[PDB]
Swiss-Prot record:
Sites bearing Phosphotyrosine, chain numbering: Y113
Subunit structure: Binds NHERF1 and GPRASP1. Interacts with ARRB1 and ARRB2. Interacts with SRC. Interacts with USP20 and USP33. Interacts with VHL; the interaction, which is increased on hydroxylation of ADRB2, ubiquitinates ADRB2 leading to its degradation. Interacts with EGLN3; the interaction hydroxylates ADRB2 facilitating VHL-E3 ligase-mediated ubiquitination. Interacts (via PDZ-binding motif) with SNX27 (via PDZ domain); the interaction is required when endocytosed to prevent degradation in lysosomes and promote recycling to the plasma membrane. Interacts with CNIH4. Interacts with ARRDC3.
Cellular compartments annotated: Cell membrane; Early endosome; Golgi apparatus
Binding annotation for (S)-timolol: D85, T90, N328, N347, Y351
Cystine connections: C78-C163, C156-C162
Keywords: Cell membrane, Disulfide bond, Endosome, G-protein coupled receptor, Glycoprotein, Golgi apparatus, Hydroxylation, Lipoprotein, Membrane, Palmitate, Phosphoprotein, Receptor, Transducer, Transmembrane, Transmembrane helix, Ubl conjugation
Function description: Beta-adrenergic receptors mediate the catecholamine-induced activation of adenylate cyclase through the action of G proteins. The beta-2-adrenergic receptor binds epinephrine with an approximately 30-fold greater affinity than it does norepinephrine.
Effect of D51N: Affects binding of catecholamines, and produces an uncoupling between the receptor and stimulatory G proteins
Name listed for the protein in its UniProt record: Beta-2 adrenergic receptor
Side Cytoplasmic, residues: 31-43, 102-122
GO BP annotation list: adenylate cyclase-activating adrenergic receptor signaling pathway; adenylate cyclase-modulating G protein-coupled receptor signaling pathway; adrenergic receptor signaling pathway; AMPA selective glutamate receptor signaling pathway; bone resorption; brown fat cell differentiation; cell surface receptor signaling pathway; cellular response to amyloid-beta
Residues noted as binding (S)-carazolol in the record, renumbered to the chain: D85, S175, N347
Native organism: Homo sapiens (Human)
Segment forming the signal sequence: none
Amino acid sequence: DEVWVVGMGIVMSLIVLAIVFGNVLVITAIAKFERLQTVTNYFITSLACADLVMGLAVVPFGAAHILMKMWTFGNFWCEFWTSIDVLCVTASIETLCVIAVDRYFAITSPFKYQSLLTKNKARVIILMVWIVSGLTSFLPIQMHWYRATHQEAINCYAEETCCDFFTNQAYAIASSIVSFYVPLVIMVFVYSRVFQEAKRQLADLEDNWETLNDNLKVIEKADNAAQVKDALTKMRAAALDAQKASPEMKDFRHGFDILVGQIDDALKLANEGKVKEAQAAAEQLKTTRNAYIQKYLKFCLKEHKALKTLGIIMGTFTLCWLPFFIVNIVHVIQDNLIRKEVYILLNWIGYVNSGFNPLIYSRSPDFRIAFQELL
Ligand SMILES: COc1ccc(CC(C)(C)NC[C@H](O)c2cc(O)cc3c2OCC(=O)N3)cc1
């Protein structure tokens, strides 16, 4: 009855408002605030602008299509709205793939990251992704490569009020497979590699710092200056290697200058035949170890949290769009065992994940503070 129509309309309008508000908040936070113009944040901007465009151009239109039960904007605008929908979905998934690739760098080769990857390069690659998505969406649709041979589709291609998405056995596969799965597979593999490599860079920081913790304890349990020499020299090598071992490393690099001097102060006292007060000189090493192990816990957790947050973004996008593409694949291999409403339901879950991205960004402290300061 009309009660269900009104309830659906109000909840879907709330969905529209949430999506638009979150996406414009993300765009404003990136554009205005001076601390939110990193190369990754440009890709976040691309994802948010794709989400905002999808919202404005699709969600009210799809709502009208499923509430009025018939399209009321013409065949051209129907073919344009479907093109926008496919374009925005492909742009979102490909932008997530590019985000994963970007996080493959700056975790593997930051030296090549902050050298040849700048804001201009980020803009170029973002426009390249958008052009590829626009091609693969508009062209097969605009030049009518998706037209279905089944007669009611031909009726709706000239009905001027029927906007049912009927596709042949080619656009279904050669669209779902490519647009979702290829960026999906690439992004999943690349981000799994990113997570494994992050678990490895942290491990490398540790093993190097693990021996510094160990050789610190043996200093107190020492009789003469012979072993404090062995402990301090290798510890100096560990400190130098740790100094040799990205953004926010400015604090990291500067601290090691203080660190290395401490061993030289202790080692020189050790290199005199006198150890009892060089024992006391190594006591300050605990203060340094406690002060920077704190800094590293903090930065690693901020990095682990940021990596998880991008991981939560990719995971929620996958979990909200995979059912739709799965039922698309299994729907066209056979003769329509899936009702349209279930198809619409899963497609609209994929629609409504668009507002999930700003919420997940709010998990990161920086984006949360930026959004709070905007509001
Ligand atoms: C009642 O009739 C209709 C009318 C409209 C719609 C919405 C639709 C336009 C299908 N949304 C498109 C969807 O987002 C999508 C995205 C993508 O990247 C690739 C593909 C894709 O559709 C299926 C495909 O074969 N490819 C659903 C039912």
